Amino acid sequence: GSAAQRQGALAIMSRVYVGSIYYELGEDTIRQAFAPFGPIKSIDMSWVTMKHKGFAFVEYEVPEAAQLALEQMNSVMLNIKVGRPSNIGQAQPIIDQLAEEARAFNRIYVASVHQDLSDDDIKSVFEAFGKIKSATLARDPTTGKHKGYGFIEYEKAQSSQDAVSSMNLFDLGQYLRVGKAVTPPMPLLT
């Protein structure tokens, strides 16, 4: 896949269809509900009877997030149906290419991480499951503070599995959202 194609596959893989949305709910509600999985980049909710259509397309900044929201979102809110944009099929080959590639790094995604924790803490907390090759938390450029999520590459596959199975929904005051990475480190490259 070309640098551009991979950049377009990642974009689609971060989109999640949300349906059965009560008519009295707006993007702010949806946003808050899915935020646990990674900061929400944008929301595309389609609205002469200015009310909407109870479906939205939430777009995360990284596909790993979309992957988790889909696995953990089957809550009420007014019930809702989660799925994927029916056009991913056009980027499926690459998406599969990114999947195959991802399996070479015992890479894991970690969302909903408290502002006070740092790359160290997270590292500290996670190395308990195995030697950690890399441990970094995404950060805001204009600030520098982590965006509440990051990635952790383990030395051993077993280590990343133990980490995942043990930390998904781990406390404190919030619940961490963890799951295996669905993409390699530099997706647009090769």
Residue numbers in the entry: 99 to 145, 148 to 178, 182 to 275, 277 to 294
The authors write:
Homologous to both U2AF65 and the yeast Mud2p, the Poly(U)-binding splicing factor 60 kDa (PUF60) shares domain features with U2AF65 by also containing two central RRMs and a C-terminal UHM. Although both U2AF65 and PUF60 are general splicing factors, the PUF60/U2AF65 ratio in cells influences alternative splicing patterns, suggesting PUF60 is implicated in alternative splicing.
(A) The structure of PUF60 RRMs in the absence of oligonucleotide was determined to 2.8 Å. A dimer is observed in the crystal structure, although the protein is monomeric in solution when unbound. The similarity of the dimeric interface of the unbound protein to that found when the protein is bound to dAdML3’ indicates that the propensity for dimerization is inherent in the protein before it encounters nucleic acid, and the nucleic acid enhances this propensity to dimerize such that dimerization can occur at lower protein concentration in the presence of nucleic acid. However, in the unbound PUF60 RRMs structure, most of the residues in the dimeric interface are not close enough to hydrogen bond. However, in the absence of nucleotide, PUF60 RRMs does not dimerize, and neither does PUF60 RRMs+UHM.
